[PDB]
Every structure is written in structure tokens, then in C-alpha cells.
């Protein structure tokens, strides 16, 4: 165990930004899926009518 | 002519709230809007972070 | 004393069978070393593969074993 | 010129489109889309995996011809002579 | 030197000709076409009936792919139907170049 | 534009070259790439930024300034990696640009193309250098050779050899030019970054279908600047994971060792995307014969748009040459592996093998193709 | 019947353009507060007797 510590100090501590990331990340990318969405509601909703005066 | 056109349905992708053409549409509209909102200020704030 | 774990877990392992099996083979590689081996004949590849599978074996097991 | 003004020239075209607080941002996306999952891929899978499988093949397959050619000296040759 | 073999190539024709989408999503041989130079002054001499018809599907025709949503299968085009009604005017075009470069020549 | 905040500066009418840009319909992921390139760009501008405070190269010295930075400098152990880690990541963000660009064969556009070219070739020779700056073993042997390898030019080769050198060594004339160059360098093709943009608003964009969408166009402000926001962090994600969790994985090139100019390490390839170019050079016997090999091998992307020979743009409406398509993309991933390894038969044939088979791939089979659909299209 | 929170909290804040970025710029800050030490025992809870906050208590304070 020793010297894999050794190579990495900040191993026990770098650790932490992992799973404070992750239940960051689950956050926001449904978050930005729904709103990028929420826009593209509109495009994917279109209506084509061709009504020539043909 | 010009007349024969009707706007077609899209309801499927709406909420039923609105879904009765009876309803103002002024009344849902008080709550409806803030949770579109809602996300909007909620989705913002963990970036800050 | 102490006696280990470790070499205390050897011995289930190579009780196994491919273990015992190639060790004849070592054996057999030796044997045919044994006058040969005044040919260039050696056993260290074979004893490799017997120690490849043998820990394999005391993998699952001693590191659980120890403290 | 202005970049939308001068584009081209169309007639006749007509459309259709709602607030996007009149509707979901999921209207029956489950239900709806996983059918679509298939055509897709099954449109392509036709013309683009197997190259793959017989490279995954050459891997094992190379690897395997590669490993005895080594491995094991006392193959071709016996320890014997 | 081809006859019954002739009928025997014209079904690959049609299995191809279904085994690019386009037949699927609506469209013909000609509207695929590659940008051309001539193709512009070939639109150009295209009437309005025959012009417009044209466009209307590509509204229509790339509108799915954002949503990749292929037509019903049956309202897909066919084969047997076809028309080449741009080619023959683009032939025109094609030749009077020809004839300039040839005098061109010399 | 009556009282726009667009004119009032005349420089943000500059500034609608963006908001009104025009933008067609059906768009894959698959063009969020260009955008997303230029992202990977800034983050490491800081990075190796604040990165090349701490760090000083001499010859003697440089290494050990390192073990100082992950170690005892604020956070410097994070950093450094991020520089890293962002490396790959952006070469894998590289080639995806290209690879729309085949798959929807946009390359009719004509110079465009040709710029696509040099800004990328600039782009690898750059970190070339930069990884020379861990100074570690396989740097060291990694920058050896492959200067050796130039030197076969048959008059002319030798000085350019100890020129560049300065020296007959790889020292310290050979390290603390580069770290200028490795340095200096990426900012001009940032300046080059944005012409090679402005040539496609001459054009407008390019679609899926190999359709002019001229009929239908978006306004970019509100749409695909969302799609980009969504594409953009996503990069975040991998980037990020990779580099906590299980940092050294591609962190493959193991070398901490001070480089020891007379030893020499059992293996050395360069780093994993060289390694097919590599591989190839391993091919050919005569050493110059794999020169002209190697460096035109990638030169052949420029021969490209000389090929193109249908009558209609987009693959994805040719199925037969997205065969070869897809063909040669393993055979691509193929040359990897092989060159993944040593210099045994097997696979020394192996990779004999698919050399040739490269070229034909491009060269011949491509432009072949296309031909006969038009005839059995009846075209 | 009374309006749900948000038609009030709509009227209340995301309407104002301020107000809606106000308590925005409020939330975050209780939440990290919050948000950071709630997290670290997950990690720390499935981090016991490794660390010196576990095992220096063996000798520490002596
Ligand atoms: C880091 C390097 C590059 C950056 C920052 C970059 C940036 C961009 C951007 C922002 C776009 C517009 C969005 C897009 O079409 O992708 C673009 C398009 C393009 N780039 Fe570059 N590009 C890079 C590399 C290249 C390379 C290496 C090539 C060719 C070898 C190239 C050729 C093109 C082409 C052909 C397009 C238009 C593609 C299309 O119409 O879909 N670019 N690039
Ligand atoms: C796409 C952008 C860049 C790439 C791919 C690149 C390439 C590299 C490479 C290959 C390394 C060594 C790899 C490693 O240390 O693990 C590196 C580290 C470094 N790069 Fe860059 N470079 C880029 C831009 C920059 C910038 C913008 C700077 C400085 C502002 C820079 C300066 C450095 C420095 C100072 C280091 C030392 C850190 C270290 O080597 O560990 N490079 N970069
Ligand atoms: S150059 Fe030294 S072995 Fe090929």
C-alpha cells in the first residue's frame, strides 16, 4: 500500500472530486436535455401544408 | 380558396390543462409558465457552483 | 513461527488439478532433461505456465486471508 | 445580400406551429420513439458491422498463429535434438 | 448482347433503386442530383407547374430527417415510377458548351 | 437596425457574422464537432499556461521542476494532467471533424478543404514537441529517432540532421528550442483558425442529405447555440472522468524515468495515435521508400476532392461505396493494433498486408464505384 | 383553491427579472454549504478506520 501512495499524496483526497462530480453531473444534463428540448419542441412540431392556387 | 385551410391538431405533445379549448387560457397560464421557468432558474444555479 | 498464510494457501491451490498436471509435466520436461539436459534442454518455460494458473487460484483466496 | 432576404425565390409553402408552453417536452417520448430505435438500426447494421467481425476474428486469429510460433520451442523441435 | 439477361439486370435496378432511401422518402433521380452549373441555367428554363412540384417535397422531404421519421411504407415511391424530366433540358445545356469549345478549339 | 446595439460600435456589426448566420434544418450531433473543436482549444490555453510557470526547461534540471509541480505547487497535480488529458481527447474530437466531413463527403468545397488540411498538420507536429517536454525516457528515444529518421535525404540530409539538432546530441539546444516552439506555436494556428471559418460564410453551411436546403434556414442565436451547450459540457464529462478516477489509462507511455541517454528502453512506439502512421514505416524495407510513404500517407486527404466522380453528393444516398466507407475505417483502427505491436512475422506480415491494402481502399476502389450506379442508375 | 407555489413563486420572482436571478444567486450558497459537508460522509461513511480522522484517534492527543 505504501508506495502506491507514494506516487499519488492527493490519491485519498483526489478521490473526493469524483463523487462530488458525479451527483454534480446527474444535475445539469437532464436539466440542459429538457430545455434544449424545450426549444426544439417547436422545429419537431412543424406542419407542411402545400395549397397551390394550382 | 383561402378559406378551406384549418389549423391541424398537435395536441398529443400538449398537457390536458390547456387541452379544453372551453378553459381560458388565462387561468392554467398563472401556474404554467414558472415550472418552464422553473427549470430555467433551477437548471442555472448548479453551474455557479 | 507464524506459519504464514501465504505459502499455508499454496498448497490447496497446487492440490488443484492443471497444477499437479503441468508439474508432471515438469517432470516430463525434466525427466527428458534429466540426461538430456546436456542439450540445451531446460523447464523453465513449462514451470511458468504451472505458476501462471497456480495463483490464479491464490489470487481469490490468501489476499482475503491476510491482515 | 442580407443574408434571409435575398436567399431564394418560393411560393405557396404554409405553416403550422404552437407556443412552446402549449405542449410537453415529452409527449409520449418513451412510448413513441423506442419503435424508431430499430429502423435506424437496423438500416445501417446491414452495411457496416461485419468488416468488423473479421477484424475481431484476424485479432484472435493472429494472436493464436502468433502464440505458438513462439510459445512453446519444444513444439516444432522437441527438447530432443 | 443482352435479352432475357436484360430483364434479369432490371430487377437489381429496382431492388438498388429501393435500396436507397430516397425511393422510400419521396424523392426521384433527378432532385439527388449534384450541384451543377449547368443544372442553374437548366432550373432556370423549368416551368413554374414543373419547378414548383419540385420543391415543395424538399420542404417537406428534409423536415423528417431532423426527426428521422421515413414515411408509411406504402406512400413510398416506386419504382416503376419515374420521371427524368430535368435530364432532357439539362441535355441541351451539355452540348451547346460542346459546340462553343469545339469552335473554341480552332 | 434602427438604434441596434449591433452597429452602434461598428464592430458588433462585425458581430453578425454569428446571431443571423443561417443555418440549415436536419443537423446531426455529428456537426456540433466544428463548434466543439475550438472549445478543447481555450481550456488548455490556460492550462499549460499557469502549467509553464512552475516548469522550466534545463536540460539538466527541467525533469525534476515537474515532480515539484504535481507535488508541492497548488493543486499542480490536477493541472497538469487536465493539459494532458485534454490532448487526446482533442484528437479524437480531430478526426470525428473529419469524420463528418467524408460521410457527408462535404468536401466540395473546394480551398476550404485545403485549409482543413495545414491547420490539422500543424496541429499533431505541435504536441510532437510538447510531449518531447516530460522528459521522460521514451520523449527522449521517441525524439531520437525520429530526427534520425530524416536524415536519409540522399545529398542534403546530414546537416539538417545537427542543425536542428545544434549539435550531435539531442541536447540541450535540441529541448529549450522547442519549449518555444511547442509554446509559441498553437496561437498562429488559433489565428489561422478563424479564416479557415470564414470561407465557409461564403457559403453557408452543408446538410446532411447533399441537398441545397436553401428553402429552409434557422436563425443560429436561439437554437444550435442550445445543441451546443448540451454538446460542449458532455466533453467535460470523459475528459474529467478519465482524469480522476483512472488517470494513467492512456496514460500508457510509462516513462517517469530520467531519460538516460545511454540506455534504452525495451519498447519504444510513440504515442497511441501516431502509432498506425509509425506502423507504416515499419513496412516498407528501404528506409527512404518509407519516408515517401509515411509523410505522403495522410497527404493522400488532399488528393481527395480530386476523386469525387458521382452525381450525387451525400454517401448515406450511395450504399455501396459506404461499404468501402466503413471498410476502410477498421482497416484504419486495423494498422493501430498492428502497429500496437513489435516487429515479430506473424503480424509483420500481417501488417504487409494491409499496407497495399490501404491505398487501394482510397485510391482506386472509391473513385471505381461510383461509375457504375450512375450507369445502373441509368444516369 | 390557492395557486400552487410557482404560479405564486412566478408572480413572486421569475417574473421580475431580478427577483428571478436574485434568489438564484441566494440558493447556491446554503446549498454548497449544505451540499458540501451532506456529501462528504457518503464518501466518509464508506471511509472508516483508513484515514487518520478514523485512526489517528489511536494516537492522537497523545
Ligand atoms: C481543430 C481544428 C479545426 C477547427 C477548430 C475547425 C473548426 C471548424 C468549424 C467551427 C467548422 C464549422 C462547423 C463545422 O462545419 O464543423 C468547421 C468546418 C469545417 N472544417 Fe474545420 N475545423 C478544424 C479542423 C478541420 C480540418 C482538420 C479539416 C479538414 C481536413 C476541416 C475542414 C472543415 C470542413 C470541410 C468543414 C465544413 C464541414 C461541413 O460542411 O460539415 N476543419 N471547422
Ligand atoms: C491543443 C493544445 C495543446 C496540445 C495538444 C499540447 C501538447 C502538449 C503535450 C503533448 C504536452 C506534454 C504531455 C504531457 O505532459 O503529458 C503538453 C504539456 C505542456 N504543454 Fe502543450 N500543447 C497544447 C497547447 C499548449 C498550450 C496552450 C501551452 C501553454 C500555454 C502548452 C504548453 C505546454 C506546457 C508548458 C506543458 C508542460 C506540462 C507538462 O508537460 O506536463 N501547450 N502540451
Ligand atoms: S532504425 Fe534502428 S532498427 Fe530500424
Given at each position: 500500500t505504501?508506495?502506491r501512495?507514494?506516487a499519488?499524496?492527493?490519491?485519498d483526497?483526489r478521490k473526493?472530486?469524483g463523487?462530488?462530480?458525479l451527483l454534480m453531473?446527474?444535475?445539469?444534463?437532464p436539466?440542459?436535455?429538457?430545455?434544449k428540448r424545450?426549444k426544439?419542441?417547436?422545429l419537431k412540431?412543424?406542419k407542411?401544408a402545400?395549397?397551390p392556387?394550382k | 380558396?383561402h378559406?378551406?385551410i384549418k389549423?391541424?391538431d398537435?395536441?398529443?405533445?400538449?398537457?390536458?390543462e390547456?387541452?379544453?379549448?372551453?378553459?381560458?387560457?388565462?387561468?392554467?397560464?398563472?401556474?404554467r409558465?414558472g415550472?418552464?421557468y422553473?427549470?430555467t432558474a433551477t437548471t442555472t444555479?448548479?453551474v455557479?457552483? | 513461527?507464524?506459519?504464514?498464510?501465504?505459502?499455508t494457501?499454496?498448497?490447496?491451490?497446487?492440490?488443484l488439478?492443471?497444477?499437479?498436471?503441468?508439474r508432471?509435466?515438469?517432470?516430463?520436461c525434466?525427466?527428458?532433461?534429466?540426461?538430456?539436459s546436456?542439450?540445451e534442454?531446460?523447464?523453465?518455460e513449462?514451470?511458468?505456465?504451472f505458476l501462471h494458473?497456480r495463483d490464479?487460484?491464490?489470487?481469490?483466496?490468501?489476499?482475503?486471508?491476510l491482515? | 445580400?442580407?443574408?434571409?432576404?435575398?436567399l431564394?425565390?418560393?411560393?405557396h409553402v404554409?405553416?403550422?406551429?404552437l407556443?412552446?408552453?402549449?405542449?410537453?417536452?415529452?409527449?409520449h417520448?418513451?412510448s413513441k420513439?423506442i419503435?424508431?430505435?430499430?429502423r435506424?438500426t437496423?438500416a445501417?447494421?446491414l452495411?457496416?458491422?461485419p468488416?468488423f467481425?473479421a477484424?475481431?476474428?484476424?485479432?484472435?486469429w493472429?494472436?493464436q498463429?502468433?502464440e505458438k510460433?513462439?510459445?512453446?520451442?519444444?513444439?516444432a523441435?522437441?527438447?530432443d535434438? | 448482347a443482352?435479352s432475357?439477361?436484360?430483364?434479369?439486370?432490371?430487377?437489381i435496378?429496382?431492388?438498388?433503386?429501393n435500396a436507397a432511401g430516397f425511393?422510400?422518402?419521396?424523392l426521384?433521380?433527378?432532385?439527388?442530383?449534384?450541384?451543377?452549373?449547368?443544372?442553374?441555367?437548366?432550373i432556370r428554363?423549368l416551368?413554374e407547374?414543373?419547378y414548383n412540384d419540385?420543391?415543395?417535397?424538399?420542404?417537406?422531404?428534409?423536415?423528417?430527417?431532423?426527426?428521422?421519421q421515413?414515411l408509411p411504407?406504402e406512400q413510398?415511391?416506386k419504382?416503376e415510377?419515374?420521371?427524368?424530366?430535368?435530364?432532357?433540358?439539362?441535355?441541351?445545356?451539355?452540348?451547346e458548351?460542346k459546340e462553343?469549345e469545339?469552335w473554341?478549339?480552332? | 437596425?434602427?438604434?441596434?446595439r449591433?452597429?452602434?460600435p461598428l464592430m458588433?456589426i462585425?458581430?453578425?457574422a454569428?446571431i443571423?448566420?443561417?443555418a440549415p434544418?436536419?443537423?446531426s450531433?455529428?456537426?456540433?464537432?466544428?463548434?466543439?473543436?475550438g472549445?478543447?482549444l481555450?481550456?488548455?490555453?490556460?492550462?499549460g499556461?499557469?502549467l509553464?510557470?512552475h516548469?522550466?526547461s534545463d536540460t539538466?534540471?527541467?525533469?525534476?521542476?515537474?515532480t515539484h509541480?504535481?507535488?508541492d505547487?497548488?493543486?499542480?497535480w490536477?493541472?497538469?494532467?487536465?493539459?494532458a488529458?485534454?490532448?487526446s481527447?482533442f484528437?479524437?474530437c480531430?478526426?470525428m471533424?473529419?469524420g463528418?466531413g467524408?460521410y457527408?463527403?462535404?468536401?466540395?468545397?473546394l480551398?476550404?478543404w485545403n485549409?482543413?488540411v495545414?491547420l490539422l498538420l500543424?496541429?499533431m507536429?505541435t504536441?510532437?514537441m510538447?510531449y518531447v517536454?516530460?522528459w521522460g525516457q521514451?520523449?527522449f528515444?521517441?525524439?531520437?529517432?525520429?530526427?534520425?529518421?530524416?536524415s536519409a535525404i540522399?545529398?542534403?540530409?546530414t546537416?539538417?540532421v545537427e542543425?536542428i539538432?545544434?549539435?550531435?546530441?539531442v541536447?540541450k539546444?535540441?529541448?529549450?528550442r522547442?519549449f518555444?516552439?511547442?509554446?509559441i506555436?498553437?496561437?498562429?494556428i488559433?489565428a489561422?483558425?478563424?479564416?479557415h471559418?470564414?470561407?465557409?460564410?461564403?457559403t453557408?453551411?452543408?446538410?446532411?442529405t447533399?441537398?441545397?436546403?436553401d428553402v429552409?434556414?434557422?436563425?443560429f442565436?436561439?437554437?444550435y447555440?442550445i445543441?451546443?451547450?448540451?454538446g460542449?459540457?458532455?466533453?467535460?464529462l470523459?475528459?474529467?472522468?478519465?482524469?480522476?478516477f483512472?488517470?494513467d489509462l492512456?496514460?500508457?507511455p510509462?516513462?517517469?524515468?530520467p531519460?538516460?541517454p545511454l540506455?534504452?528502453?525495451?519498447?519504444?512506439?510513440?504515442?497511441?495515435?501516431?502509432l498506425?502512421?509509425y506502423?507504416?514505416?515499419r513496412?516498407?524495407?528501404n528506409?527512404?521508400?518509407?519516408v515517401?510513404?509515411?509523410?505522403?500517407?495522410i497527404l493522400?486527404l488532399?488528393?481527395?476532392?480530386?476523386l469525387?466522380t458521382s452525381?450525387?453528393?451525400?454517401?448515406?444516398?450511395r450504399?455501396?461505396?459506404?461499404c468501402?466507407?466503413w471498410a476502410?475505417?477498421?482497416?484504419?483502427?486495423?494498422?493501430?493494433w498492428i502497429?500496437?505491436?513489435?516487429?515479430?512475422h506473424?503480424?509483420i506480415?500481417?501488417?504487409?498486408?494491409?499496407?497495399?491494402?490501404?491505398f487501394?481502399?482510397?485510391?482506386?476502389?472509391?473513385?471505381?464505384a461510383g461509375?457504375?450506379?450512375?450507369?445502373?442508375?441509368?444516369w | 383553491?390557492?395557486?400552487?407555489?410557482?404560479?405564486?413563486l412566478?408572480?413572486?420572482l421569475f417574473?421580475?427579472?431580478?427577483?428571478?436571478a436574485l434568489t438564484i444567486?441566494?440558493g447556491?450558497?446554503?446549498?454548497?454549504?449544505?451540499?458540501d459537508?451532506?456529501?462528504?460522509?457518503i464518501?466518509?461513511h464508506?471511509?472508516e478506520?483508513?484515514?487518520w480522522?478514523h485512526?489517528?484517534?489511536?494516537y492522537?492527543?497523545?
Open positions: 505504501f508506495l501512495w507514494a499519488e499524496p492527493e490519491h483526497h473526493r472530486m463523487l462530488k462530480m453531473m446527474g444535475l445539469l444534463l436539466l440542459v436535455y429538457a430545455m424545450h426544439w419542441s417547436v412540431s412543424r407542411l402545400y395549397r392556387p | 380558396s378559406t378551406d389549423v391541424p398537435f395536441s398529443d405533445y400538449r398537457r390536458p390547456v387541452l379544453d379549448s372551453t378553459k381560458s387560457s388565462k387561468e392554467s397560464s398563472e401556474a409558465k415550472f418552464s422553473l427549470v444555479v448548479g455557479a457552483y | 513461527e507464524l506459519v504464514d498464510p501465504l505459502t494457501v499454496r498448497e490447496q491451490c497446487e492440490q488439478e492443471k497444477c499437479v498436471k503441468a508432471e509435466r515438469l517432470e516430463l525434466d525427466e527428458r532433461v534429466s540426461s538430456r546436456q542439450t534442454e531446460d523447464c523453465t513449462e514451470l511458468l505456465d494458473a490464479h487460484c491464490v489470487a481469490h483466496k490468501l489476499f482475503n486471508s491482515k | 445580400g442580407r443574408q434571409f432576404g435575398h431564394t425565390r418560393v411560393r404554409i405553416t403550422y406551429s407556443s412552446p408552453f402549449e405542449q410537453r417536452a415529452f409527449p417520448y418513451f420513439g419503435p424508431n430505435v430499430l435506424r437496423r445501417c447494421i452495411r457496416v458491422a468488416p467481425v477484424f475481431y476474428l484476424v485479432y484472435t493472429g494472436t498463429e502468433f510460433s513462439k510459445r512453446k520451442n519444444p513444439a523441435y522437441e527438447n535434438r | 443482352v432475357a439477361s436484360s430483364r434479369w439486370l432490371e430487377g435496378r429496382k431492388w438498388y433503386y425511393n422510400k422518402l419521396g426521384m433521380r433527378d432532385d439527388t442530383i449534384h450541384e451543377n452549373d449547368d443544372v442553374k441555367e437548366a428554363r416551368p407547374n414543373l419540385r420543391v415543395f417535397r424538399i420542404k417537406r422531404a428534409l423536415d423528417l430527417s431532423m426527426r428521422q421515413i411504407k413510398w415511391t419504382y415510377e419515374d420521371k427524368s424530366y430535368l435530364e432532357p433540358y439539362l441535355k441541351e445545356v451539355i452540348r458548351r462553343r469545339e473554341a478549339k480552332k | 437596425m434602427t438604434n441596434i449591433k452597429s452602434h458588433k462585425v458581430n453578425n454569428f443571423d448566420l443561417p434544418s436536419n443537423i450531433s455529428w456537426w456540433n464537432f466544428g463548434s466543439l473543436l472549445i478543447c481555450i481550456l488548455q490555453i490556460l492550462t499556461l499557469f509553464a510557470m516548469y522550466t539538466t534540471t527541467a525533469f525534476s521542476s515537474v509541480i504535481c507535488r505547487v497548488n493543486y499542480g490536477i493541472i497538469r494532467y487536465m493539459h488529458n485534454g490532448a481527447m484528437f479524437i480531430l478526426y471533424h473529419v463528418r467524408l457527408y463527403g462535404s468536401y466540395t468545397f480551398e476550404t485549409i482543413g495545414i500543424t496541429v507536429a504536441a510532437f510538447g517536454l516530460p521514451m520523449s528515444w521517441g525524439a531520437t529517432v525520429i530526427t534520425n529518421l530524416l540522399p545529398y542534403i540530409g546537416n539538417l542543425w539538432w545544434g549539435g550531435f546530441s541536447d539546444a535540441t529541448l529549450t522547442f518555444a516552439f511547442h509554446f506555436l498553437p496561437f498562429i488559433m489561422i483558425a478563424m479564416v471559418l470564414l470561407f465557409l460564410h461564403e453557408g453551411s452543408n446538410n446532411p447533399g441537398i441545397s436546403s429552409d434556414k434557422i436563425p442565436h436561439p437554437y447555440t445543441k451546443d451547450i448540451l460542449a459540457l458532455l466533453l467535460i470523459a475528459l474529467m472522468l478519465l482524469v480522476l483512472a488517470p492512456l496514460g500508457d510509462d516513462n517517469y524515468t531519460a538516460n540506455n534504452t528502453p525495451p519498447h519504444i512506439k510513440p504515442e497511441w495515435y501516431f498506425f502512421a506502423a507504416i514505416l513496412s516498407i524495407p528506409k527512404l521508400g518509407g515517401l510513404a509515411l509523410a505522403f500517407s493522400i488532399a488528393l481527395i476532392p480530386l469525387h452525381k450525387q453528393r451525400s454517401m448515406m444516398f450504399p455501396l461505396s459506404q468501402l466507407f476502410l475505417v477498421a482497416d484504419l483502427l486495423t494498422l493501430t502497429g500496437g505491436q513489435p516487429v515479430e506473424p503480424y506480415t500481417i501488417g504487409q498486408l494491409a499496407s497495399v491494402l490501404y487501394l481502399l482510397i485510391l482506386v476502389l472509391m473513385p471505381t461509375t457504375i450506379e450512375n450507369k445502373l442508375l441509368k | 383553491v390557492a395557486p400552487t407555489l410557482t404560479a405564486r412566478y408572480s413572486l417574473r421580475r427579472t431580478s427577483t428571478f444567486v441566494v447556491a450558497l446554503f446549498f454548497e454549504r449544505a451540499f459537508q451532506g456529501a462528504d460522509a464518501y466518509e464508506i471511509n478506520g483508513k484515514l480522522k485512526i489517528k484517534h489511536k492522537e492527543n497523545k
